[PDB]
Symmetry: C3
Subunit: 260 residues, 3 copies
């Protein structure tokens, strides 16, 4: 239901594989997704992660039928899944230190959007549609979407998407900063795999450091920004990948990077 | 009188700046009445959405000139007491409104007028709207939360340019920059703002209040806090009447009817 | 000699990178002299604006390669000492300047050169200016505050692509993204920057300093703190000479002269 593999080049592939339900997230999906993300995060050989999905739609979020059962069974506790399933998935995704690429086809809504916005690089097919969804069904937000959406497109457009509840299309998402590239529908997994392959061959420690600097320094005082930068640069200055790159540059030559 | 207040049958509170002869310049009367209207809208359980608009050609030119001149001649050291006394409670009252706030912006929107407009959630601009900080043009800095609201909407760089260079920007620029959500024909901002408020007033009001609070609280929060707050908000709403109604509507592939609880 | 410093008649401090033969690559001499120029500018009470520019075709290609190679071969474990010893004080010194800072960007602006440029308030680029982070290209991450300043200017998505994929952008992309305020003909950026700096220098310098500090303090502050700080700053400016001058001049349909207090 969620496929996981790590190839020779150290690219971990996580594929949502429930296309008949538009990759709607039932307990089986949520459990296997968590496992896939934790494995990617805990494997020292993984130098990049690519997240993709089978069928026409990336992820429509929570499985409706499973939600109906919980709601009819115990309405005061029907959102237990947020703590039990969604939160650890988002934390597992966040814990991944290497670059994460996502290939977004068709519908990407609710927790599906939440999952996608947790990646570092986002590639959309031309017919991709992005939506908060939660307020449409009288809910607010989960899957970190109340933070990740405004941080990518700003508070004003995030607020509009949540209150008006309308889907936006791929070009609008590109213009707004929600995704990095728009490609032909059916091509985003191929492009994401190439981008992930390219990242996996790069200086993995440098990528992990800069990713962490970016997260920590978003709103920090300048003094803290500069101190953390200095320390990260000192660690990388001593890395094998840094000497290899400098030596390659002097030799008018292309470096091979190994991630340390 | 100077600020008109009413609440319709749909639960839309309408707030109208009604001093068009002075381009809705904020004197003591305007400020005191604006506060009362905002507090009334914020405290009324029946209000499901708020719409802010302005009579005449211009939305709001900010602080009343004559009145400020009197204060400045009378006592230069205390000429800006009104910021604490009037503008700050106004911005807190607007911020305290839990439900969606929509504003129709026509013509000049500058100074405290701009601060007021940027406190709204959805901003609808007329073709001939003009936005400007105005403060440094007369040797002041900023009030009406504009030193936070502007950079949060258009980014630090463009906000810094508006404040330092005193650049006024037009409607399509404001749109592209993210200062307003839509640009329509001049004269229409009110009508479009009213439709939008009406639409939002018919939506899941408890969910709208929750998500607005989540967006505000989670802007720079650690992930663990973001996720905990989201879990709690969803659990509160999972027990709402609107959520059950929406679930059974979705099962039939209908759009739900919402009552706001 | 490596960095030129002067303060003109109008209180404009000019800082010019003047190692054109090396595309203004920052070696120890250059870094030390840049720090002294920024400290002089920040501590001089006659200074009312700052303009940063560079001789030759390229603004600044960042760290000097030859000096870096020598440190790396001598002692790899400490090869980045310079970040703490040189770059960090430079960025703090730039940040400590209270008055407006304008930068003119010709040609290549990469690495620490980009960091330096993004610490300015107003950025004017020539048509052939190019911007890149460069660090990960050689297995480093970030310095010169770029892990903060870049995403704060262009957003998290674009900054992440620049850092991770090594995407280099040209002037019109930079303009659309909000990385620079203006693109002019190559070989006009310093001219335009000087005009802008000159206009800012003749402006209400105390007001400019207050609003810049308000913008920085209030970026992520709670509304109560935002409003309190705005009121205090407005009260201080309300009693300034420049503010009275502005108001008297507007009443007499006349241009005001500002002295910065």
């Amino acid at each position: 239901a969620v496929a996981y593999s790590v190839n020779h080049a150290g690219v971990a592939a996580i594929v949502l594989d429930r296309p008949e339900a538009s990759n709607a997230l039932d307990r089986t999906m949520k459990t296997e997704l968590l496992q896939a993300l934790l494995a990617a995060g805990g494997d020292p050989a993984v130098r990049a992660v690519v997240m993709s999905a089978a069928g026409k739609n990336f992820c429509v979020g929570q499985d409706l039928a499973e939600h109906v059962e919980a709601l009819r069974d115990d309405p005061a506790h029907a959102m237990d899944t947020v703590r039990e399933h969604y939160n650890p998935v988002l934390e597992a995704l966040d814990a991944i230190k290497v670059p994460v690429v996502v290939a977004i086809n068709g519908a990407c809504v609710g927790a599906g959007l939440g999952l996608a916005l947790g990646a570092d690089i986002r590639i959309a097919g031309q017919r991709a549609k992005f939506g908060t969804a939660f307020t449409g069904i009288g809910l607010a937000a989960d899957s970190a979407l109340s933070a990740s959406l405004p941080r990518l497109i700003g508070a004003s457009r995030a607020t509009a998407m949540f209150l008006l509840g309308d889907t936006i299309d791929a070009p609008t998402a590109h213009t707004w900063g929600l995704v990095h590239e728009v490609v032909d529908e059916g091509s985003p997994a191929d492009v994401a795999n190439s981008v992930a392959g390219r990242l996996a061959g790069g200086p993995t420690a440098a990528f992990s450091e800069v990713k962490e600097l970016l997260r920590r320094n978003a709103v920090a005082p300048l003094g803290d920004v500069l101190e953390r930068e200095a320390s990260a640069q000192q660690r990388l200055g001593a890395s094998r990948d840094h000497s290899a790159a400098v030596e390659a540059f002097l030799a008018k030559d292309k470096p091979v990077f190994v991630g340390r």
